[PDB]
RNA sequence: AGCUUUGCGCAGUGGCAGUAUCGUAGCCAAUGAGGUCUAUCCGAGGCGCGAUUAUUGCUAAUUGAAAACUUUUCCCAAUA
């Protein structure tokens, strides 16, 4: 169904972003800035700073290629 | 026909700032730069390197000079 998007990112992240976005058409009609925020759980900072909780983070960030980078 | 909006030059007057302005045959960037607020939201340059009195010229003092110093075979000691 989505060969190019499965080539760029793994099919697990592909499925997790396609399901949460409402389908391939809805995800394709979504701005690029709103795709990085798909599946971003509002983790509650437990005393720690907001940066430690990694705010505004979604499937893309936790994908394999992005997680293969230094944290900075 | 007057008035008026925006952009752009050309000038004139005035104010403020000098820890900053400028450069890019370097790289990257609306096919997304860059993200602490408020992020299914913000949207523009950034990075590297180089120049410098932290933009650069003239103008006028002062100093350093510069022009000169005898810029020319002395002394301790020996003998006639």
Q: Which nucleotide is nearest to A57 (CA to C1')?
A: B39
d(CA A27, CA A37): 12
Instruction: Quote the tokens at residue A5.
Output: 């998007």
Beta carbon of A12 within 7 Å of strand B?
Answer: no
Answer yes or no: is A70 CB < 7 A from strand B.
no
Whether the Cβ atoms of residue A38 and residue A59 lie closer than 8 Å to each other: yes
Nucleotides of B under 7 A from a protein CB: 32, 34-37, 39-43
Q: Backbone phi, then psi, for A65, in 5-degree steps? A: -70, -40
Cβ atoms of A38 and A19 closer than 8 Å? no
Which structural technique was applied?
cryo-EM
The CA-atom distances, in angstroms, between A5 and each of A2, A16, A25, A29, A35 are: 6, 12, 13, 14, 12
**A32 CB less than 7 Å from any atom of strand B:** yes
CA A59, CA A57: separation in Å to the nearest integer?
7
């Amino acid at each position: 169904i989505a060969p190019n998007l499965s080539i760029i990112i793994g099919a697990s992240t592909a499925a997790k972003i396609m399901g949460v976005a409402g389908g391939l058409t809805n995800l394709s009609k979504m701005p690029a800035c709103n795709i990085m925020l798909l599946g971003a759980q509002r983790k509650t900072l437990s005393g720690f700073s907001s940066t430690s909780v990694l705010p505004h983070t979604g499937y893309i960030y936790h994908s394999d290629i992005v997680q293969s980078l230094p944290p900075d």
